[PDB]
């Protein structure tokens, strides 16, 4: 089946790229936080805020289906 | 054997930094459900009451359908899988198990629900590999199945979602991935 094949192929190509990107986003975040000179407690808060967005995204990603 | 790419699946299953474990398990589980019923969908013609009067995974394994203290039912592979996939889907649609509303928590027993779903999905792969790999090849979908399965196994290993014992029907295959 052609639908299955294309769909899986796309899924696996995306899966890897998204993973890589997500890692880079995390790093970039850490750098930005040093560059801005956020205090430790501030960094914690910032990480948490960003994490919330990502988990909300995951939910919707499932949910919208 | 063959896979769809040279991507690192071991890393891709890992919980991202700061991510919620329950949410991660939930999204990935929906994905595998979707994959497995697509994959099974492609060979459903070759999986009949005639070919598969029991839900087999080679000669050493015979699964019986159960959810309640209900007595497990011996049934054909097409039936077993029908029952299974309907049951899983129903869980996935249940707001109390898989909450949709933002901010709403997963239930107390969430891990248990996910594990139950995943160990059952595994049985579908096991049946396909043991009984319908000829059809898989014929359809040139070995790379697709193998990648899906590999992904699945890494995921369940990473989060301790299925016991070694439960994986036994495919132990050899799994080891090769090892
Ligand atoms: Zn069959």
Residue numbers in the entry:
A (entry chain C): 21 to 85
B (entry chain A): 33 to 99, 102 to 212
What's the paper's own text on this?
Biochemical evidence suggests that MOB1 can associate with the highly conserved N-terminal regulatory domain (NTR) of NDR/LATS kinases to promote their activities.
To delineate the interaction of MOB1 with NDR2 on the atomic level, we determined the crystal structure of the MOB1/NDR2 complex at 2.1 Å using purified MOB1 (residues 33–216) and the NTR of NDR2 (residues 25–88). The structure of MOB1 adopts a globular shape consisting of nine α-helices (α1–α9) and two β-strands, as reported for unbound human MOB119, 32, frog MOB133, and yeast Mob1p34. The central intermolecular interactions between MOB1 and NDR2 are hydrogen bonds and van der Waals interactions, with the two antiparallel α-helices of NDR2 representing two interaction interfaces. MOB1(Q67A) and MOB1(H185A) mutants did not interact with NDR2, illustrating that the observed MOB1/NDR2 interaction is specific. The overall crystal structure of MOB1 bound to NDR2 is very similar to the previously reported structures of MOB1/LATS119, 20. Most significantly, we discovered that His646 of LATS1 bonds with Asp63 of MOB1 supported by a cluster of surrounding residues involving Phe642, Met643, Gln645, Val647, and Val65019, while Phe31 of NDR2 does not interact with Asp63 of MOB1. MOB1/NDR2 complex formation is dramatically increased by prior MST1/2 phosphorylation of MOB1, while the MOB1/LATS1 interaction appears to be fully dependent on MST1/2 phosphorylation of MOB1.
